[PDB]
Ligand SMILES: O=C(O)CCCCCOc1ccccc1CN(C(=O)c1ccc(-c2ccco2)cc1)C1CCCC1
């Protein structure tokens with residue numbers, strides 16, 4: 657309880673140092689950004705704002721998701737490396753962790769910039785509506801909406817940034833990942849983060865009953881969210897041959 661408090665402080669600093677936007681700053685903005693809600697406003701935003709050559713509205717928007725997804729893998733990688741227990745693993749295990757962990761963490765973190773009406777883009781200087789993203793053609797509308805369903809429920813838990821750092825540290829440092837070399841070591845670290853999380857919630861959310869087991873179920877739900885995301889990504893790679901898929905995301909899905 658004493659030790660695990662110090663542990664959590666370090667993981668929080670890892671978080672504050674590496675992530676380009678806190679949930680704190682996102683809610684404050686979300687409560688002014690340029691609203692993108694149709695083709696004209698997307699154009700004006702671009703003309704708020706170097707991607708692959710143009711194809712069409714839905715694909716262009718998918719290119720922008722893809723670029724932000726890659727940018728977030730970057731942050732998550734620096735954040736992981738800022739955790740001494742992560743950085744102490746052999747480099748191959750770090751890659752295995754990030755490979756199977758980042759999309760779960762990405763979708764967890766995504767909730768911070770989402771409300772029921774849309775999400776922030778371009779570092780908070782823009783806001784893209786959910787109805788606009790719903791209007792894109794299949795399969796680009798289908799891959800977007802489920803993340804929204806997840807976020808609004810997740811945001812009802814009202815985690816702050818110090819909760820999120822442990823929660824995401826817990827997602828990354830997961831002994832379950834296929835092809836781990838040193839499983840007992842990663843399981844041990846995961847257990848520690850989870851114990852630290854449990855205590856942290858006790859102090860930070862003293863009136864929130866069931867919050868810890870609530871968040872453990874969200875980790876199980878994120879796992880299913882990502883399975884469905886990869887399946888949709890398989891369909892896009894198969895039916896949308898003219899859409900470019902970033903090589904880094906390719907190396908992640910190839911598993
Ligand atoms: O999986 C992969 O690796 C392949 C990529 C598919 C990812 C599916 O993308 C989704 C789905 C749901 C919610 C958000 C996003 C994309 N994101 C955005 O922040 C974002 C960025 C730009 C726009 C935009 C600009 C102009 C008009 O719209 C809109 C949203 C999040 C997601 C996680 C990191 C970023």
Ligand SMILES: CCCCCCCO[C@@H]1O[C@H](CO)[C@@H](O)[C@H](O)[C@H]1O
Nearest residue numbers: 729733751754755904907908910911
């Ligand atoms: C930047 C952090 C995220 C990295 C995620 C990408 C991991 O890709 C994997 O890299 C391995 C070599 O390291 C290959 O042996 C695997 O075939 C490949 O799937």
